[PDB]
Design a protein around this ligand. Sequence first.
Ligand code: NAG
Lengths: 46, 50
Amino acid sequence: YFKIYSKHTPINLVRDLPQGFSALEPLVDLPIGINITRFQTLLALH
Amino acid sequence: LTGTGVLTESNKKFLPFQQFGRDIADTTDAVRDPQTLEILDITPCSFGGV
Ligand SMILES: *[C@@H]1O[C@H](CO)[C@@H](O)[C@H](O)[C@H]1NC(C)=O
């Protein structure tokens, strides 16, 4: 099961990650059964 | 999910991702209905010694 959780929150600290607590709720759960070992992000080329 | 109890209106704001709630004991406290998607509170039926 590939479980996806996410949350959007305002932030005001670019040197590190702001201090506080927030739990992320599940949104999608895909029963793919794929052996996943690596991932990468995609940025918009400009 | 089966049981016996009184189903009444409730004001517990279930979040979009939870479907049923359980007590400190492994039993249902409230449930979300199918077909109409609503939140029913479950209060145990009255009982007692005679
Ligand atoms: C079941 O019927 C009700 C009656 O209109 C409808 O609102 C509901 O969407 C139906 N269930 C599903 C899963 O669509």
